[PDB]
Amino acid sequence: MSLQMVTVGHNIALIQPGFSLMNFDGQVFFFGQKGWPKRSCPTGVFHFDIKQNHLKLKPAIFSKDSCYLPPLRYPATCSYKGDKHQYIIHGGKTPNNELSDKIYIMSVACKNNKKVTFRCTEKDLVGDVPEPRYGHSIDVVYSRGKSMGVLFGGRSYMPSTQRTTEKWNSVADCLPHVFLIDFEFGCATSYILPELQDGLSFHVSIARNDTVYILGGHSLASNIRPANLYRIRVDLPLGTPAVNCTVLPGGISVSSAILTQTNNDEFVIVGGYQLENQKRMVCSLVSLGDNTIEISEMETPDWTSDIKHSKIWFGSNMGNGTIFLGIPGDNEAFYFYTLRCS
DNA sequence: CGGGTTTTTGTCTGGCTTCACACTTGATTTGCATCACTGTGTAAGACAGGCCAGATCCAG
Numbered sequence: 001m002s003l004q005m006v007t008v009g010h011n012i013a014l015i016q017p018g019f020s021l022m023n024f025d026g027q028v029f030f031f032g033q034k035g036w037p038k039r040s041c042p043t044g045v046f047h048f049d050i051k052q053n054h055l056k057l058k059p060a061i062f063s064k065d066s067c068y069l070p071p072l073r074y075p076a077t078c079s080y081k082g083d084k085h086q087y088i089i090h091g092g093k094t095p096n097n098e099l100s101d102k103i104y105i106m107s108v109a110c111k112n113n114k115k116v117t118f119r120c121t122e123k124d125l126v127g128d129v130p131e132p133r134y135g136h137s138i139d140v141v142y143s144r145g146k147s148m149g150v151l152f153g154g155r156s157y158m159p160s161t162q163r164t165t166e167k168w169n170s171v172a173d174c175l176p177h178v179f180l181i182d183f184e185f186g187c188a189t190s191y192i193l194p195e196l197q198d199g200l201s202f203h204v205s206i207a208r209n210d211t212v213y214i215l216g217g218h219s220l221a222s223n224i225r226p227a228n229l230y231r232i233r234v235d236l237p238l239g240t241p242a243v244n245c246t247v248l249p250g251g252i253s254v255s256s257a258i259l260t261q262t263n264n265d266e267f268v269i270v271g272g273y274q275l276e277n278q279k280r281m282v283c284s285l286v287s288l289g290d291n292t293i294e295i296s297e298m299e300t301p302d303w304t305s306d307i308k309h310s311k312i313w314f315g316s317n318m319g320n321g322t323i324f325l326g327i328p329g330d331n332e333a334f335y336f337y338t339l340r341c342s
Numbered sequence: 343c344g345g346g347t348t349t350t351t352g353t354c355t356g357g358c359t360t361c362a363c364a365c366t367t368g369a370t371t372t373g374c375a376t377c378a379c380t381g382t383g384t385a386a387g388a389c390a391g392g393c394c395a396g397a398t399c400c401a402g
Contacts, residue, residue: 039388113397 001283001301006324006336007054011040014057015326015334017312018073021048022087023319024108024116030057033071035095044071045118048318055336063109066120069102070094074134076154078207080183082140082147084108088183090151093134097169099156101132103181125181128190131156133174137214138181139207143236150212150232151179151188155201155220173199173220178232178243195230195245198222202255206267206286210234213293215286216272218255225275227251229293250295254280258325260317260341268298268341270323281308283341301339 019032030046037044041059049056062068072092080086086107092100102122109119136154140147153174157163163170176196181188203217214230228251234243257272257280265288271280281303287294306327307313315325321342327335 001299002340003301003304004053004338004340006050006338008336009054009056011057012332012334014046015336016073017314017326018093019316020072020075020077021316021318021324022077022106024085026320027116028318029060031071032073032075035071037071043068043118048324050338053338061115061117063117063119066118067104067122069104069120069122070100072100076136076138076151078138078140078149080140080147082142088138088140088149090138091133091136091154099132099134101129123183123186125186125188127187128179129188130179130190131174135201136174137203137205139205139212141207141210141212141234141236143210143234146236147183148234148236148241149179149181149183150205150207150234151181152203152205152212152214153177153199153201155199171220173201175199178245180234180241180243191243193232193243193245195247200226202272204254204257204259204269204272206259206288208265208288210236215269216252216254216257218273225253225255225273227253231293248293250293252284252295256314258315258317258323260319260321260323262321262342268321270325270339277311279311279313304337306335307337 014033016032016034019030022029022031028048030048031044033044033046043060043062045060046057047060049058069089072089072094075092076088076090078088080088084107086105089104089106094100102124105121105123107119107121108116110117130151133154133156136152138149138151140149153176155171155173158167158170158172176193176199178191178193178196179188180191198219198221200214200217200219204215206213206215211231211233214232216225216227216229218225229248230245231248232243232245234241254269254272254274258270260268262268267286267288268283269286270283274280282300283298285296285298287296310327312328313325315323318324321340323339323341325337325339327337329335
């Protein structure tokens with residue numbers, strides 16, 4: 001817990017709320033800029049590099065067989081190492097306010113002189129495909145030497161029937177179904193769980209060997225931020241998979257929280273949004289066991305007077321137990337701070 | 343495809359209004375053309391080129 005100011009280069013206007021920092025072997029990379037990419041960097045992926053408390057965003061290139069995906073403002077990021085380390089991107093929101101549904105897979109194809117070359121391959125789904133949506137979260141699951149993705153519901157626009165031009169930007173939470181996506185083939189399947197009763201968005205999901213921990217979130221159906229955490233334990237036999245969910249005591253009511261990993265089988269979460277005009281300022285610690293959980297309240301960081309009164313704040317995860325968050329200014333549009341918690 | 347029964351009107355009828363209608367000229371009052379100018383055009387992005395830095399290579 002140690003705040004620190006971070007200066008910026010010339011291209012500060014390219015950062016916007018909802019970006020996604022991706023980490024590949026120590027190097028943190030930027031994605032999800034504002035507007036369509038210009039001739040400064042046609043790809044849109046930037047080398048997120050901080051040195052001497054100073055940010056320097058520089059362009060990056062793709063391979064000769066990649067796919068130039070549009071910048072997304074609320075994708076679903078997750079790590080996947082099952083080989084070549086690679087990330088997964090689903091959903092998002094294009095700069096034309098259009099929701100995407102295609103899955104993109106990032107990967108490092110070549111590198112030299114500290115200059116990487118990405119490989120963005122397109123991935124399509126079959127069977128029970130999910131509605132294009134944002135604010136959701138996807139995780140990976142390992143079971144009996146086999147991988148599988150878990151996609152929880154989020155929010156999206158009106159369906160193609162009731163959507164009218166007088167409410168063209170209305171948003172409703174998607175149905176609380178669990179989607180299992182096989183990355184090797186591309187076949188998704190929708191399951192129903194009686195425990196999942198209401199839609200949830202902007203939540204935080206913790207992944208492990210074979211169980212996903214959904215903690216907190218925001219429900220648009222009733223405008224309530226619940227304080228219940230879920231435990232979706234799955235299994236991958238030779239036959240059809242089986243999913244189960246059990247509610248658990250001791251939840252947390254936070255929306256738009258930023259999660260990061262500190263040690264092996266241990267996570268720390270920072271504040272998000274507690275109420276509409278009330279802002280969560282104290283952090284929480286998540287300690288895992290083998291079939292149990294544990295939450296506690298760490299020492300509150302030495303917040304500054306500008307953050308203590310700012311209404312909006314956003315950020316993401318760098319990867320080395322470090323959080324990069326920003327504060328809006330006036331008319332220098334954002335003030336970006338970093339946070340290290342070992 | 344046209345018979346009854348009221349509406350809808352121009353007159354017949356001649357005799358009472360209130361406005362209409364020839365001339366001036368000297369003003370007096372309106373109406374309209376003319377002339378040199380006006381505002382709204384009002385922040386960033388693409389590209390080539392010199393410059394060191396540092397990586398790339400040479401030979402004792």
